Symmetry: D2
Subunit: 329 residues, 4 copies
């Protein structure tokens, strides 16, 4: 149980919603006079007025540094190559770590099983959560999500942030009397590594699994920078709607290392009709659903032409007198 | 240690070359009067003349059946939708299982640690090996590979078989005093599941690992049916040349299940200059080599922007006053 | 009016159906005892028995030659690297040119506007038509198309031929009392060059136009080797269903020149419900239809964000005080 | 000769460099105290101080409006969804049109063959040129291009602008005694429509042509957001180096209309060694050069497997006794 997995569980156990921290972010947004649009500058003004922290734009930082905070002189340097939404995210992260320290500490104190390292990692996680809840204040963002029928591009345009940030925030809308579609958010790379798992409730991939090549999230790299959608059926009959898309980090140069990821958002099929991404698709036809699994070794399907491995709790039929398109019959 | 892994190791231990069986395949090829070009027809005639086995092309077989052998009437039914190279492969598989039974049994008897099921899986594996060594007789195939500078498409065209079959056979050219480029052959899917591992000698991915998203094999699906090439450097400094390409199964219909795989062939950089795939590429410039790993949890690189997980034997450094492009620095 | 365009018109004027030639191909198929499956061998037998023509498989031909017929000794050589469907196509083409010469001549004689070169080009075109009508005899192919709901992959599997050949034959099903879906067939390359136009009746792209980047046929290369589908609306309100897919020629080698094409098949929206490719799509929602054009200079749309050129018969609004996402407002 | 072509030629005749206007942009940049990094803010302040123009960021503008200028109250509204580089570009466009009116008029007066509409289009073109020359002052941009070895991503990162803007400016570095690599810049879509042509000197595609599917610019869409590179040889023996990449407009929503374009930059092969994009590529091997053309009807190659149409000044050779891989041999 490594610390990043420990924090994964910390968030999964709390339905991916932190009521104290989300309320605090929204309260501060409103009390400060914030207005959506160009939050980076207003957050600079807020750090100055409320914390004596001076926010500067630094093209002198090392290439890989997004921000650096000097607590001795209270100076926050932010990378020039970050877009305004990204600058705002960095500034609000530091704002959480400086001005919401005690709240974060008390939230961490509620899971006493946490490893020594897991507590620091959770501090950073709650700081990122605060930044998301501030850039995307709960009520305004929820109403915008409903009005826009969950169009992630349009939400990003309205709030001045990227795709991954929007999907993050969508998977946290579990406030008691104002809930959005319950989502599972995942992040993957070209090799099937799932870097991030967040979920409003229990989904198949909340903690483990997801190495099924028929799952559309892995097809996002085959269709780069375009939204892919799938009506999927798990081996147990439960049906889900999946949207996914690639995200690439600009800059770095032709030679340099590049960041390529795929962000995917899934929900119960019953909710799909509320998404713009359901437009043009029939949702009431179980014949049109794509049968996927969780990874071949833990998948009990018997007629899958794509099986890479045999099912673990399964009987290996070996026939010298037959050959089929169905590996590991 | 599941049986398919036991057979993976069985072949790995023999440098992916089976001298008795390969010599037997070539002996039978030449003694029977075989000539490359239309092996399917000649193999049918051979089964008749030498084993009393009647080969029919049966469009009445189930959709997913490639072949079926009835030993009571010695009837081999072969799917009509298989190309001639594929039909030849099926017929030669049955030829190995019927006319080379004892040789295969004695070869299996040499790895006595094999589980009961692993022996059956090994019989199927050795029959496939024999089919490959028969359709592609060793000396003729080796001379053609050198003449064609390892152009896999041109080899397939010359011998009437597909990409995966050619790569299979290329990774087996370890006959003493007539060796080809030592290769590692792998097969993967969109989810990074590595279905096949065969290797002439010790490579990093001969048995485990290979979930590095910077590795070109996983970039094959973004460029389907197009050959991708990479000069890669493992974290230990050793450099390799990798060629890869996707392979899709035709038919099945728009709705039906589809087979999508990616086949990759790797060798030491020192051999790359003998490949047609090196044309246009500089091989002597360590600056141009792509730093890849074997999977993030077992990768010790320190400045990778693509890290999905932290390195296992390392402490997760967490800094509240900085944010970087380098996850898990 | 160049000769290939002249033959384009020759076929367009005849509703892409040649009743005499199609009936002759089917009549000969049936009288000869032909059975679907492995037509290449049976056509060899037919050339021998009926025309004294000897069909041989020649790996000695130049790389680019699919067949060569020596009339002095009546010998037809066919390339070894052609699949059986392709071999059958070559053999039946020569069969049309040798055994249906007078019929072809009389069909050509019906369009007396033909240029000197256009008559020879039309001879080859009618020979290809005969080959298609023979490999795919009309009644059997029509019934298979209806039973399979026009699944091009499954039709290819059943009849042992490729995607482009199937789409060719589908666009010719205009026999008076046994018509299939009326189609427009097109072939394009990565640069928008439309090499082939065939159509059962008058469609927008039967003769000219088709340089609209929003048209899905040009998106086939972005999604290689996978079927793409679109519900499109022309500027005049008429709605069409478009299926398209790439096709690549095997062999040639890593260095050599490659053939990449996209084949597209379109029909009136009203017919889409009879296609398997309509599965999962709502067809009764004009809101979900993609507005395309015929090429920007002849497209009268006013709010297209993708306009590359202004509409020819249009008023150029030029405003120094505004900038928009809509080029050439 | 439509007006947009007239302006294309207007710029082509001046080697895509406007000395007075470029010097004016740089003069104003330096005299005003401008420093690269946050030009949007400084340009707003400059419009205030120097022209009494009040710049507001207006989230109330219509969805498709990038800017709108009200001269009666001297109010410049700029779209909230534009990144800072884009906002700076809009503001500098208006700055050219308001504060450089007479210079632009006198520059337009030098091509007196211009149609009435061509003069307005040329005014917009010269304003865009000025905006490019201001956001990217000539000397600083030239020094940065050489230092960065023409890495377009790194230039964009350094100056806070996108790919298309950098390529625009790179193709204008023809100031006497301080020249950059002479470039041809083109913009195309999925249908091969070439929306933009700018060129430092005489290139094949400076005015017409470019519909060759083997040309790498059209392969950009198959690999979106990834840089593609090609060493190409025209039929006349002259060899060029081509870099290309797609550019997509964010937002707009899943349903809405999308802008997809491909931008390409070409130079003589002799200059390629100065590009970062040449790293790993051999430049002195004529065997490895890809033979491309300018469009099949104006391409005289004789063994091209990709020909879509026959060569215009040639007779279509038709052989009834042969079939080949070479259409229109
Ligand atoms: C996972 C890592 C370590 C990786 O960091 P990266 O360098 O890849 O990127 P990043 O810093 O997360 O930022 C990437 C994008 O995500 C956005 N973003 C990040 N966290 C967000 C949040 N909580 N809410 C909203 N948006 C958020 C940022 O704005 C940014 O957008 P832009 O790019 O547009 O600017 C980090 O995210 C992190 O430390 N998170 C907090 C700790 C945590 O939650 N760990 C559990 C992860 S779950 C896990 O690891 C389990 C997986 C498993 O099963 O093994
Ligand atoms: C792996 C399976 C079980 C599944 O195979 P599939 O049904 O998906 O396909 P396939 O039968 O292998 O056929 C696909 C193509 O491979 C070709 N092919 C297959 N074996 C070949 C060989 N030995 N030599 C040459 N070509 C060969 C066939 O001609 C065919 O070509 P066409 O496509 O053109 O028709 C099978 O291949 C098999 O039983 N192999 C023998 C058992 C074995 O060796 N297992 C160890 C694998 S190593 C492993 O799985 C462990 C790896 C790990 O644990 O990480
Ligand atoms: C167009 C050319 C010149 C190009 O030949 P290519 O080398 O590109 O390929 P090809 O010989 O046509 O064969 C390619 C595939 O098409 C199939 N195929 C070809 N003709 C067929 C037909 N009539 N019916 C069924 N299938 C057919 C072959 O089986 C083959 O399948 P496999 O690959 O799987 O084996 C040729 O097709 C031709 O000469 N056709 C006859 C003359 C004609 O009709 N000209 C008008 C074309 S329309 C036009 O040019 C107008 C465009 C415009 O607007 O300017
Ligand atoms: C071509 C049009 C009409 C259409 O343009 P669009 O609306 O599609 O986009 P856009 O306005 O050009 O802006 C897209 C990106 O290009 C950048 N950009 C535009 N002009 C630039 C310049 N001169 N220097 C540097 N960057 C420039 C913008 O910053 C912007 O960056 P971001 O995307 O990051 O925001 C327009 O560009 C224009 O009016 N140009 C001036 C008229 C002109 O020169 N016409 C001749 C073109 S030659 C032609 O069309 C004929 C070719 C032929 O006939 O074959
Ligand atoms: S066996 Fe299960 S997990 Fe594996 S590919 Fe098939 S459906 Fe997916
Ligand atoms: S950390 Fe290692 S395994 Fe992971 S992406 Fe980077 S190089 Fe590959
Ligand atoms: S203007 Fe017409 S032809 Fe051009 S992209 Fe738009 S819809 Fe297509
Ligand atoms: S004929 Fe010329 S223009 Fe056409 S694809 Fe070949 S090289 Fe390109």
């Amino acid at each position: 149980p490594m610390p990043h997995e420990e924090v994964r569980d910390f968030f999964y156990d709390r339905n991916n919603y932190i009521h104290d921290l989300d309320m605090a972010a929204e309260r501060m947004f409103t009390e400060s006079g914030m207005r959506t649009g160009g939050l980076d500058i207003q957050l600079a003004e807020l750090m100055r007025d409320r914390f004596g922290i001076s926010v500067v734009i630094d093209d002198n930082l090392p290439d890989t540094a997004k921000r650096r905070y000097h607590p001795d002189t209270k100076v926050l340097r932010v990378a020039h190559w970050l877009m305004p939404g990204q600058r705002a995210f960095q500034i609000a992260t530091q704002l959480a770590l400086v001005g919401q320290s005690d709240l974060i500490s008390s939230i961490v104190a509620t899971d006493d099983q946490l490893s020594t390292e897991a507590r620091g990692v959770a501090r950073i996680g709650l700081a990122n959560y605060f930044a998301g809840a501030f850039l995307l204040p709960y009520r305004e963002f929820h109403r915008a999500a409903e009005q826009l029928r969950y169009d992630i591009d349009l939400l990003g345009r309205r709030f001045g942030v990227g795709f991954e940030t929007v999907c993050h925030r969508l998977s946290t809308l579990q406030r008691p009397r104002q809930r959005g579609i319950p989502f599972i958010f995942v992040r993957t790379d070209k090799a099937g590594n799932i870097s991030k798992r967040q979920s409003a409730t229990a989904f198949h991939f909340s903690r483990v699994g997801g190495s099924c090549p028929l799952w559309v999230v892995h097809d996002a790299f085959a269709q780069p920078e375009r939204i892919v959608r799938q009506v999927a059926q798990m081996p147990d009959g439960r049906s889900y709607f999946w949207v996914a898309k690639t995200t690439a980090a600009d800059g770095l140069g032709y030679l340099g290392p590049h960041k390529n990821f795929a962000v995917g958002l899934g929900c119960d099929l019953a909710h799909a009709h509320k998404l713009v991404y359901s437009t043009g698709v029939v949702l009431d036809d179980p014949s049109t659903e794509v049968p996927i699994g969780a990874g071949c070794k833990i998948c009990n399907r018997t007629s899958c032409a794509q099986r890479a491995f045999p099912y673990l709790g399964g009987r290996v039929a070996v026939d010298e007198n037959a050959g089929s398109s169905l590996p590991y019959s």
